């Protein structure tokens, strides 16, 4: 059982509960005043994980109930954080975030991530952060942090890590992404080169590896998204960073009489019930879901010639149409 235990870890430790007297002293107590200790017997730690499993024996069966119905993508999509109403697109993408892949190795070699980086903008409501508690609950090796919050020394590793190092190979989640000040933003600005942090300070020359994914919930410049201001004005963030984000979901709220009825019906229905979907959808349990995603990450697909060319042409059209729009 030795070395099984590691610092900072909640664990149910079972064992015979015993004294080991007294070594003396022996004058002071008097007596005998045992003071005891716990002999370890068994060890069960809370919170033990894909991508590592061999089989894929009869567990595929547990995947198939999910597959056979077909339209897995929309099904799972909806099945992420059903607790909130709307934003099927946002969730639609978050499924991808959880899945990730495929990166690449150029054989020389250097790497290209490798993963997805999501932002969620808009304010004050729309419940953006609940999606992040959601994800960091579903994904293993997920970690939820906030700016003031998680200190700069929170993400970097001291010599005696946290956040980014603590959660890597899996999704990291950030709230209040504006208030994080400066030194933090440099870390995160760099981590989109993936595979890196570099700590040159004092007793540390190391460069540790963070394979982290990042999801960042942020609020537009005060108060909320002033439409008389251009984008990038009401987003306080520099363009050096946003180029890194592949998908920025800006969630803006304009009151709509029809829809908000539906919403209110939802948030009244639950509370009133615990289980949200009825007539009809089947919410996919996070456990089996994690299994499916686990079986997903194993594939490493490759592009055909036709989709490539298509991507290119559509990219020229997207560039040209974006710039013809004007500054």
């Amino acid at each position: 059982l030795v070395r099984s235990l590691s610092p900072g870890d909640i664990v149910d430790v079972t064992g015979i509960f015993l004294p080991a007297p007294y070594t003396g002293f022996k004058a002071l107590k008097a007596g005998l005043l045992t003071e005891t200790y716990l002999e370890a017997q068994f060890v069960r730690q809370h919170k033990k994980k894909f991508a590592s499993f061999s089989l894929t024996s009869d567990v595929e069966e547990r995947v198939m109930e999910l597959i056979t119905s077909g339209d897995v993508y929309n099904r799972l999509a909806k099945s992420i954080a059903p607790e909130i109403y709307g934003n099927l697109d946002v969730k639609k993408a978050l499924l991808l975030l959880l899945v990730g892949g495929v990166d690449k190795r150029v054989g020389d070699g250097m790497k290209i991530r490798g993963d997805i980086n999501v932002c969620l903008m808009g304010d004050p409501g729309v419940a953006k952060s609940q999606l992040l508690k959601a994800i960091c609950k579903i994904s293993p090796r997920g970690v939820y942090t906030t700016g003031k919050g998680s200190s700069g020394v929170g993400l970097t590793a001291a010599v005696m890590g946290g956040a980014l190092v603590l959660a890597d190979n899996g999704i990291c989640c950030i709230d209040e992404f504006d208030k994080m000040d400066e030194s933090d933003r440099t870390a995160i600005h760099e981590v989109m080169e993936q595979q890196t942090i570099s700590i040159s300070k004092a007793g540390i020359n190391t460069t540790l590896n963070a394979r982290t994914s990042i999801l960042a919930a942020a609020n537009p410049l005060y108060g909320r998204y002033n439409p008389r201001l251009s984008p990038l004005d009401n987003i306080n963030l520099p363009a050096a960073l946003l180029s890194r984000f592949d998908i920025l979901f800006l969630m803006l709220d304009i009151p709509s009489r029809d829809d908000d009825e539906k919403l209110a019906e939802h948030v009244t229905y639950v509370h009133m019930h615990n289980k949200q979907p009825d007539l009809d959808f089947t919410p996919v349990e996070p456990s089996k879901m994690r299994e499916y995603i686990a079986y997903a990450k194993t594939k490493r697909p490759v592009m055909s010639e036709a989709v490539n060319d298509y991507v290119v042409q559509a990219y020229i059209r997207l560039r040209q149409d974006s710039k013809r729009e004007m500054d």
């Binding site: 590691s6 020389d108 290209i112 005696m160 570099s198 460069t207 990038l232 050096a240 020229i316």
Partner: protein
Amino acid sequence: LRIIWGTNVSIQECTTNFRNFLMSFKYKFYYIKQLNEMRELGTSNLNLDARNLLAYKQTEDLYHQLLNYPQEVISIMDQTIKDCMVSLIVDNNLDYDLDEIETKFYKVRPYNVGSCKGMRELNPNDIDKLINLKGLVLRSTPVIPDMKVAFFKCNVCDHTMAVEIDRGVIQEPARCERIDCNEPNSMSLIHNRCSFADKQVIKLQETPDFVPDGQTPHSISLCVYDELVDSCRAGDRIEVTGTFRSIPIRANSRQRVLKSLYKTYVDVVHVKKVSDVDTSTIEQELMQNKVDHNEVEEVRQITDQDLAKIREVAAREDLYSLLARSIAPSIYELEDVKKGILLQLFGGTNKTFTKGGRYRGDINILLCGDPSTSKSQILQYVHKITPRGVYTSGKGSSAVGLTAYITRDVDTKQLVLESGALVLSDGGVCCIDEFDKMSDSTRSVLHEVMEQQTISIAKAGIITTLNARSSILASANPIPNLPVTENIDLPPPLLSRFDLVYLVLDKVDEKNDRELAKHLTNLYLEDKPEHISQDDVLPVEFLTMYISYAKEHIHPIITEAAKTELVRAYVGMRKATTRQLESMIRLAEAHAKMKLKNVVELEDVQEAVRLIRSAIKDYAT
């Protein structure tokens, strides 16, 4: 067979198995050569190798007998190497005058037995074993004297007889010596007269690079012995081998009782030890010399008809364009980067004046931009072509590391000067990763190099200003609008100093990314690698002999023609700093160095400016 206790490594068996181990290369997959070196010096301490016995047969098992039972095996090994010295001498008859040289003490110093994982991983089940360890040394303790042969006395008569310690205990006879006399009275132990042997103590952190993070590393005190004592100082991160030991400690206080939890330390029997064609002007003497005593090879030689091909290709008008596509075949578009670097290969013209002068040909290039832009790939390629260049990462660097190490040689146990990384890089091209990220003390080296073109070392042993003349190609990763001059970070004075500073930016190409994707998304297919940029006309080995030829046989001068346009460019920029001018006149002369022109045209200074303006068309945003 003479079984020995529980170690069960038999005497008069393994001795012979080791005795016929002699004279082997063999194998491998030295040995007697190094021993024959050993016999003269009288240094003793045979360092061995390990691994030798593995996979070699016989003594495949001896490796396991030593690894599992090093205690006896080292003693037997020493006896056997001693008697193999004795058998070495009789072969040459009378040696060294005569038998006294054999009497001198010898020992084996085994090392590198398997690769052990840390101190931390270690089981309590292996307490007699050879164990690698690594970590810095926090302190070297003062020398404690260790009993070897004990001395004794009595009130009667007094008599001088004494007994050796052997095992880690001391038992003196109650009564008595010589004779007799007797009486029962307690023995008088002289403290100072008896013999002693050096035992240091060395604290070692467990591999601070390998840690639970954040828990502070665990101490390992390795006690050494003999010659090894006082052979080290502190902070040495390298490695150490030796036998693990658990010995009881006396606790509270007094009482003569054992704490029953044995402390653990390492015997550490061994310790082991530390941590395109060249230009003419640079060669100089080795041309002016090496002719007299003669020699062969050196400067690359060219046939006639291929020369006749170069002087033909020079005629081709698109040449300046052509070579630019030929440099990086894998790398797509971004032609002006390829191009500026193309001139980095031809850079400048060297000038000695009467004396001094020496502006060389050096031209220096930083380039920054969005990640995954191939900015590192170029570094690799230039590194591959340039004959003498050296490739350094950020933070893997220090001002001591870039010149003048003054290390101990460890072969001769002497102090020898080593060339730093910039001194090596003298001539050709130093390549730098992540330049933005260098520590603040570093970059203070570069203000010396970039200007002076030499480095001045007054430190430590030898005080001199030594020459490093080298190009620099630096990569940078920045932290629309914003001040750009702000957004490269850097102190702006250093930043203005770089000859040509590239900023990667969208060229509005559409119309590019498709082409580039055609390039990279290949391989891909075909799986086999054929061509690459095809169909594109490309030189391959021709461009290197071309570049070389250009460099040695051409020495361009601006003449009356550059200066007008040359200046008006600088003013046009001023309407920055004077370095930008220096830049232009050097960079341009590279262009003119190409095309085989001894004199610059008034033309060709146009693009020579435009390259500096190229980044400006990229500074618009």
